[PDB]
């Protein structure tokens, strides 16, 4: 395996005191997407000054990020003491399509030491460490974040000029203050500047060794190093994962000044990452020698669409998050950073949906006892059970047999189990599994040619299964049998008419064929009646040997309907707490298995009574009869149209909600449109909404001026004036 070097000199570790309340700070850093902050450069291509749209993983424009700050541990006087660190070791996060980070942006400024903040020390960039892997769990002391199998390790080592990465198995240590020890608090790593990073001899192994003091490496399968040189300037870094393996990105190698990410490195590991965490670290420096460190931030990535402003020099300089606002939607639609002034349509509100009510039921458990005993039929002898008005739990039936073939055409198998129906139909039969190669709903095999077919007008499922040794009330056929031919001879003795089986029907040939085929290749005939024009019925068949456990198959079809849907899964209605008659403005619903969403109203009761629902000419539900004797009318729910007034001359905007009126308007919306509307709030956080004859608007101001042409008419006599020119 990899030559990581020697095991730690001791299993013992430095004690870790958690000082986390010292580290609570509020220093948010929202993304300046206008500056292209956090933008990952496109893979392998470059461009001229043309602006183009692009799709890929990106940070949200409004994300303030997560903040972490590394700090010095305890030391007093002229010497080191015990570590004083943040509780960051417990911050496990799920991996979520990568992340990017901001490093050192607070450089050449001052702040505080935090752990001893009264010092008000100047701050400098410090590089982050991380661990990634497919699983996490409790330390033997119940502590958060213990890892399994192999994990990624990323650490700066000693001075930031050296970067290291590994893929290896961690091992707990029994030393005091270490993971298998019972004096353990939490894992941390450290650096000791008093001898570390000598100017003529930087300590390249400093950080790795302090890591080694808490864990013993095993099976290291990868290691990497990288060359970095000091520069207090902000740098960006990040991680993504693809089927090509993990990728590393940095702004430093190519675009140190503009911050655009480039694929600095890649990693061979193909294991999927499920979890991510930040490794805590601390400085062992002397109490009078303490140095505050610049804040560190992290941002999530998502597969967002962005407008991108490439520089003629190929750097991305500006970008637009299309989903950030309704205003941003407009820019993306015009592929530009300067939409002509006007009023423009934007997407409508979803109108605020609420929790479900149902009017299903009722009925009794669907008796499935015909399947529990006797011998199942030959492929041309099928038994059928029609189920109406009853309740079921098909998994109870699944426990009774081993299923060796599950397939459902036109419906997921989970859904067919959960769906409620006007009918449920089950066909069942003996069937050797030696013949399973010839059976599917679409099969060309003789079983489907002459013995059974299913309509495709209805969704279907198929099951093949066998009998458990404790289900002996069910018994075996002497031989499995099937009809492998079914045709009628023409009365003229020169030609013959084939007879494929009709869907959902017995083959006509069953009238002559025996309950079992006595011998393989047996054939039978019957003269046709003179009403049939004469000729002879003909059929033949084949057999399959009996088996130790009975083998059987099933056919399932279902039937859709409205007020006939009395077949349902067993249901529990506890704590709805109310159904129809409880309003509501938008609620999910199901009535007798008919899904929908809407608001109901107590109204009259047009006919026909007891017909369940009521529909318009376009087959949309109009209303519904209920067992409380009340007709309910249904209005679905009502969406809210939106439009935006845009003044490019002053670079300002305002909005109109249309006919909805200010009575349904609130300062925020759960209804909802785009993730924020804060750009309107830049002025309208300070004012009430304004009703107008067309509709309610935001940030308009009632000046009662008379102007002949606003070049921004709102329709009718309404007119939005631009503010005066600069």
Ligand X SMILES: *[C@@H]1O[C@H](CO)[C@@H](O)[C@H](O)[C@H]1NC(C)=O
Ligand Y SMILES: *[C@@H]1O[C@H](CO)[C@@H](O[C@@H]2O[C@H](CO)[C@@H](O)[C@H](O)[C@H]2NC(C)=O)[C@H](O)[C@H]1NC(C)=O
Report H helices in 326-439. 326-333, 394-398, 413-418
Q: 21 is in the binding site of which of ligand Y, ligand X, its own copies, none (Cβ under 5 to 8 A by kind)?
A: ligand X
Nearest distance from C-beta of residue 201 to ligand Y, angstroms? 9
Distance set, CA 562 to CA 558, 573, 592, 602 (Å):
13, 20, 7, 21
Other beta carbons less than 10 A from residue 614's beta carbon: 18
Cis previous bond, 577, omega within 30: yes
For residue 35, report the phi and psi dihedrals to the nearest 5 degrees.
-95, 0
Determine the Cα–Cα distance for residues 285 and 291; give it in Å rounded to an integer.
8
The answer to whether 713 and 342 have CB atoms below 8 angstroms apart is no
Q: Which range of residues in 101-109, 162-170, 381-389, 439-447 is near its own copies by CB under 8 A? A: 381-389
Contact characters 300-319, ligand Y, x per CB under 6 A: ------------x-------
Nearest distance from C-beta of residue 225 to ligand Y, angstroms? 4
Instruction: Show contacts with its own copies in window 403-462 (CB under 8 A).
Output: 408, 411, 416-426
**Per-residue tokens: 100:** 């990017």
Nearer to ligand Y, 107 or 550 (CB): 107
Strand order in the sheet with 536-544: 496-498, 480-489, 536-544, 523-527
Q: Which member of 362, 628, 649, 723 binds ligand X (CB under 6 A)? A: 628
Contact characters 573-612, ligand X, x per CB under 6 A: -----------------------------x-x--------
Q: Which member of 46, 174, 457, 527 binds its own copies (CB under 8 A)? A: 46
The answer to whether 349 and 640 have CB atoms below 8 angstroms apart is yes
Distance set, CA 380 to CA 10, 236, 365, 501 (Å):
79, 71, 29, 10
Q: Which member of 46, 48, 602, 678 binds ligand Y (CB under 6 A)? A: 48
Nearest Cα to Cα of residue 165 among 312, 303, 265 = 265
- # residues near ligand Y by CB under 6 A: 12
Say what the alpha-carbon torsion angle 439, 442, 444, 446 is, to the nearest 10 degrees: 50
Instruction: Show contacts with its own copies in window 349-378 (CB under 8 A).
Output: 378
Write the CB contacts of 21 (distance below 8 Å, at least 6 apart in sequence).
none
Determine the Cα–Cα distance for residues 349 and 95; give it in Å rounded to an integer.
31
Query: Judged by CB under 8 A, does residue 296 bind its own copies?
Result: no
Query: Judged by CB under 8 A, does residue 22 bind its own copies?
Result: no
Instruction: Show contacts with ligand X in window 306-325 (CB under 6 A).
Output: none
Query: Judged by CB under 8 A, does residue 2 bind its own copies?
Result: no
Q: 159 is in the binding site of which of ligand Y, ligand X, its own copies, none (Cβ under 5 to 8 A by kind)?
A: none
The answer to whether 207 and 161 have CB atoms below 8 angstroms apart is no
The β-bridge partners of 293 are 124
Nearest Cα to Cα of residue 291 among 129, 79, 130, 125 = 125
Q: 227 is in the binding site of which of its own copies, ligand X, ligand Y, none (Cβ under 5 to 8 A by kind)?
A: ligand Y
Q: Which member of 20, 48, 174, 717 binds its own copies (CB under 8 A)? A: 48
Query: Judged by CB under 6 A, does residue 110 bind ligand Y?
Result: no
Instruction: Show contacts with ligand X in window 199-258 (CB under 6 A).
Output: 219
Query: Judged by CB under 6 A, does residue 272 bind ligand X?
Result: no
Instruction: Show contacts with its own copies in window 129-168 (CB under 8 A).
Output: 134-138, 148-149
Nearer to ligand X, 531 or 617 (CB): 531
Query: Judged by CB under 8 A, does residue 392 bind its own copies?
Result: yes
Q: Which member of 46, 97, 140, 149 binds ligand X (CB under 6 A)? A: 149
Interface residues with ligand X (CB under 6 A)?
1, 20-21, 24, 87, 90, 135, 138, 142, 148-149, 219, 511-512, 529-531, 602, 604, 628-630, 690-691, 702, 704
């Amino acid at each position: 395996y990899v030559d990581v070097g020697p095991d730690s000199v001791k299993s013992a570790c430095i004690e870790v005191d958690i000082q986390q309340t010292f580290f609570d700070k509020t220093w948010p850093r929202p993304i300046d997407v206008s500056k292209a902050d956090g933008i990952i450069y496109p893979q392998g291509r470059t461009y001229s000054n043309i602006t183009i749209t692009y799709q890929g993983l990106f940070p949200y424009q409004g994300d303030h990020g997560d903040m972490y700050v590394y700090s010095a541990g305890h030391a007093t006087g002229t010497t080191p003491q015990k570590l004083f660190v943040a509780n960051y070791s417990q911050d496990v996060k799920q991996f979520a399509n990568g992340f990017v980070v901001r490093i050192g942006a607070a450089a050449n400024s001052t702040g505080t030491v935090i752990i001893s903040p009264s010092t008000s020390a100047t701050i400098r960039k410090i590089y982050p460490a991380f661990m990634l892997g497919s699983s996490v769990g409790n330390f033997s002391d119940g502590k958060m974040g213990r890892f399994f199998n192999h994990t990624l390790v990323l650490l700066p080592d000693g001075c930031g000029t050296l970067l290291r990465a590994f893929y290896c198995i961690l091992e707990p240590r029994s030393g005091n203050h270490c993971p298998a020890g019972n004096s353990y608090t939490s894992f941390a790593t450290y650096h000791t500047p008093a001898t570390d990073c000598s100017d003529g001899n930087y300590n390249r192994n400093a950080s790795l060794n302090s890591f080694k003091e808490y864990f013993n490496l095993r099976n290291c399968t990868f290691m990497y190093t990288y060359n970095i040189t000091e520069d207090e300037i902000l740098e960006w870094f990040g991680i993504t994962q693809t089927a090509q393996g993990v990728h590393l990105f940095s702004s430093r190698y190519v675009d140190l000044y503009g911050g655009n990410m480039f694929q600095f490195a890649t990693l061979p590991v193909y294991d999927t990452i499920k979890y991510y965490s930040i490794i805590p670290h601390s400085i062992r420096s002397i109490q009078s020698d303490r140095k505050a460190w610049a804040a560190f931030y992290v941002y999530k990535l998502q597969p967002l669409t962005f407008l991108l402003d490439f520089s003629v020099d190929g750097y991305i300089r500006r970008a637009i998050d299309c989903g950030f606002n309704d205003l941003s939607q407009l820019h993306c639609s015009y592929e530009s950073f300067d939409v002509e002034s006007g009023v423009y349509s934007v997407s409508s509100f979803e109108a605020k949906p609420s929790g479900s009510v149902v009017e299903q039921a009722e009925g009794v458990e669907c008796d499935f006892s015909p399947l529990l005993s006797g011998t199942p039929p030959q492929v041309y002898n099928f038994k059928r059970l029609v189920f109406t008005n009853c309740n079921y739990n098909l998994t109870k039936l699944l426990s009774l047999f081993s299923v060796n073939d599950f397939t459902c055409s036109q419906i997921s198998p989970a859904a067919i189990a959960s769906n409620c129906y006007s009918s449920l139909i089950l066909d069942y039969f003996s069937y050797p599994l030696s013949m399973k190669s010839d059976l599917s709903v679409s099969s060309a095999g003789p079983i489907s040619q002459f013995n059974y077919k299913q309509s495709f007008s209805n969704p279907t499922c198929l099951i093949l299964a066998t009998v458990p040794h404790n289900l002996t009330t069910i018994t075996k056929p002497l031989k499995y049998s099937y009809i492998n031919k079914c045709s009628r001879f023409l009365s003229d003795d020169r030609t013959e008419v084939p007879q494929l089986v009709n869907a959902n029907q017995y083959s006509p040939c069953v009238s002559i064929v025996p309950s079992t085929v006595w011998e393989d290749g047996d054939y039978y005939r019957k003269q046709l009646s003179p009403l049939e024009g004469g000729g002879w019925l003909v059929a033949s068949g084949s057999t399959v040997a009996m088996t130790e456990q009975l083998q059987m198959g099933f056919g399932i079809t279902v039937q859709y309907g409205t007020d006939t849907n009395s077949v349902c899964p067993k249901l529990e209605f506890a704590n709805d707490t109310k159904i129809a008659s409880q309003l509501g403005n938008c609620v999910e619903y199901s009535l007798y298995g008919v899904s929908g969403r809407g608001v109901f109203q107590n109204c009259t009761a047009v006919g026909v009574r007891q017909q369940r629902f009521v529909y318009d000419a376009y087959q949309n539900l109009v209303g519904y009869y209920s067992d409380d004797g009340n007709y309910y009318c249904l209005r679905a729910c009502v969406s809210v149209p939106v439009s935006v007034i845009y003044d490019k001359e002053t670079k300002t905007h305002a909005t109109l909600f249309g006919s909805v009126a200010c009575e349904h308007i609130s300062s925020t919306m759960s209804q909802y449109s785009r993730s924020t509307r804060s750009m309107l709030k830049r002025r309208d956080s300070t004012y009430g909404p304004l009703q107008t004859p067309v509709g309610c608007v935001l940030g308009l101001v009632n000046s009662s001026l008379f102007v002949e042409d606003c070049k921004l008419p709102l329709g009718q006599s309404l007119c939005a004036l631009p503010d005066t020119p600069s």
